Amino acid sequence: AFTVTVPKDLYVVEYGSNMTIECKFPVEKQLDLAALIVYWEMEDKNIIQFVHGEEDLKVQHSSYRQRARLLKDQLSLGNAALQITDVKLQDAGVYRCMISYGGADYKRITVKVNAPYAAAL
Amino acid sequence: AFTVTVPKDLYVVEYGSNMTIECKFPVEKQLDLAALIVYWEMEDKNIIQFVHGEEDLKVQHSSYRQRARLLKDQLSLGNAALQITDVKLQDAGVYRCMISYGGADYKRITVKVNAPYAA
Ligand SMILES: Cc1c(NC(=O)c2ccc(CNCCO)cn2)cccc1-c1cccc(NC(=O)c2ccc(CNCCO)cn2)c1C
Numbered sequence: 001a002f003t004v005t006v007p008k009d010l011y012v013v014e015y016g017s018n019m020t021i022e023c024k025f026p027v028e029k030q031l032d033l034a035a036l037i038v039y040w041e042m043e044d045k046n047i048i049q050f051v052h053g054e055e056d057l058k059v060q061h062s063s064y065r066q067r068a069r070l071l072k073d074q075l076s077l078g079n080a081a082l083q084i085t086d087v088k089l090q091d092a093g094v095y096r097c098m099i100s101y102g103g104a105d106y107k108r109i110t111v112k113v114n115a116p117y118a119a120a121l
Numbered sequence: 122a123f124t125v126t127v128p129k130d131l132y133v134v135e136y137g138s139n140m141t142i143e144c145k146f147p148v149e150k151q152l153d154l155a156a157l158i159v160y161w162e163m164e165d166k167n168i169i170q171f172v173h174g175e176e177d178l179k180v181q182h183s184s185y186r187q188r189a190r191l192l193k194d195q196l197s198l199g200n201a202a203l204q205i206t207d208v209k210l211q212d213a214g215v216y217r218c219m220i221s222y223g224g225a226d227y228k229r230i231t232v233k234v235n236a237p238y239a240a
Contacts, residue, residue: 002172037225051224059122100221103172104158 002026002103009109013087015116020071020083021109023097027078037100038070038080042093042111048082063090089113123147123224125201130230134208136237141192141204142230144218148199158221159191161203163214163232169203184211210234 005024013019033053040048045061047068060068064084071081080097092113098106126145134140159171166182169191181189185205192202201218213234219227 037221039225098219098225098227100158100225104160104219104221104225106219 002101002105004097004099004105004107006097006107006109009107010112011109012112012114013091014114015087015089017087018083018085019087019111020081021095021097021111022074022082023080023099023107023109025078025080025099025101025105027076027101031076032101035101036075037098038075039098040068040070040080040082040095041098042091042095047084047095063088087113089115123222123226125218125220125226125228127218127228127230130228131233132230133233133235134212135235136208136210138208139204139206140208140232141202142216142218142232143195143203144201144220144228144230146199146201146220146222146226148197148222152197153222156222157196158219159196159201160219161189161191161201161216162219163212163216168205168216184209208232208234210236 007022011019011021038048038050046059047064048070049059050070067085069083071083074081080099084091092111095109095111096106128143132140132142154174161169167180168185168189170180171191188206190204192204195202201220205212213232216230216232217227
């Protein structure tokens, strides 16, 4: 009954740009931070580990340091939004958002990074 | 950090036998059932979805009906044990236990099913 949805499960992004990938969960009235867990990962790499309102940046995988953050202002709209700055080719793959809030659910999201290309016509 | 561990991360099982795969999670004093979620899957197939003490058999994947059980006597010892009855060849693959209990964590278990072979 506790359901996480994704508007899209495939994001095609340009090398070196910014991307935001979103996972929706139901929230009514006061977001209870003490009951909320948000985890983002990409093939076992810890990107975001938001646990009961607190984050520890020492658990964050080194290839995501100063690039990856949770947009905490979106959480009141039931939106766990992961913003990644300066997208790399190694950022392509399968991301998971995993959310515990009342129930639990997770989604898979595929990211494709186009190789850098000077398109001329 | 809430941590789930696995004694074995690979199980080799005989076709048609039973297996039990275990995920350990830390539990102190009274198991707070209102706070606990245990979820087992394999390749997006819902095997066990234990939510605060309640299970919906109607959410279980058709291929696990009457075959898959969570051993609830183990939960008080912090053991999330999935027992699968009458193992098929299509039970081979990657299982996941996901546990929310204070914190949250999940682990992967690989199951390989040996094709039936006569001595
Ligand atoms: C597991 C989990 C996290 N994970 C972390 O916080 C986390 C942090 C760090 C590490 C790595 N550590 C390595 C050291 O061992 C790993 N995990 C965060 C929020 C929630 C969960 C959770 C916990 C328990 C259960 C369910 N699912 C389900 O209950 C579930 C049920 C049904 C479905 C299928 N639904 C499809 C329809 O949308 C999916 N799902 C989830 C999703």
